[PDB]
């Protein structure tokens with residue numbers, strides 16, 4: 001979208017000041033996000049990715065339900081700015097757009113800078129599980145099917161591999177072999193959900209560190225800021241995915257793999273914060289799987305990155321041809337380290353469960 005086009009889009013919303021600029025904000029993989037600067041307040045303007053989220057009406061119904069409930073509890077959350085026609089979003093020139101108020105005086109992190117920040121992230125997402133337990137499974141629509149159904153993701157991967165539409169398979173044999181050889185590990189959470197041994201809960205489903213805003217002065221969690229995948233799942237998806245992104249010593253797309261390690265110190269910090277909020281609620285079987293949920297969600301996301309690479313990068317935004325291969329490689333290195341530290345992560349969870 002050109003500058004003129006974006007100003008036109010913003011004109012559809014009930015903003016409370018004259019727009020001075022609209023500039024790309026962040027490096028999200030999915031939606032297209034802009035910071036709108038006025039002569040007074042600031043706003044986040046987003047074009048929703050309708051290739052990924054085709055059901056905008058149900059997506060926005062979820063977002064409206066979650067934010068209105070948080071507000072009714074006095075909690076800070078994403079504040080939808082309505083269109084001038086009074087709607088929660090608008091279709092404008094072939095795009096689906098929404099506006100949130102910009103949440104001021106915050107810090108957000110694409111990588112853990114210190115254990116305290118990750119411990120606070122643990123508190124925030126653990127607290128968010130208690131919030132989501134207030135909803136029935138049926139109140140929140142699945143916005144994406146099979147979202148953390150790792151065996152289903154693996155079927156998708158094999159289809160991408162078989163098509164090999166760009167002939168990229170030949171250059172990622174070792175990565176393909178990793179996901180093939182780990183196929184026996186993908187079913188554990190889905191099987192437990194299906195047999196009732198793992199409770200079905202409403203979960204956030206994209207608990208990466210940069211989805212919590214911390215207060216710029218105190219560092220206390222202020223608000224969670226991606227509500228697009230709130231829907232039934234397992235607590236293990238939220239824990240495991242937090243560990244995948246945040247217990248890494250490197251960026252998700254770190255090109256130098258010698259920078260990429262799984263840190264048990266960071267794993268412990270997050271576990272302390274998360275289990276601290278949930279200790280009397282977590283089931284024995286959930287606790288048992290906390291360390292492996294890290295391996296599982298990391299393998300699932302890596303497999304998705306590699307599938308996308310093999311499909312010509314149709315899902316995730318990329319900046320260069322091998323971007324998704326580079327992303328997949330970090331996830332592989334992390335899993336390999338998580339495997340080597342399995343006894344230690346088990347002992348960490350036991351100690352936190354005992355301590356809390």
Ligand SMILES: CC(=O)N[C@@H]1[C@@H](O)[C@H](O)[C@@H](CO)O[C@@H]1O
Nearest residue numbers: 029030205206208228229252301
């Ligand atoms: C809606 C969607 O696919 N979101 C994904 C999330 O699943 C994935 O873990 C992450 C990796 O950085 O990128 C996006 O946030």
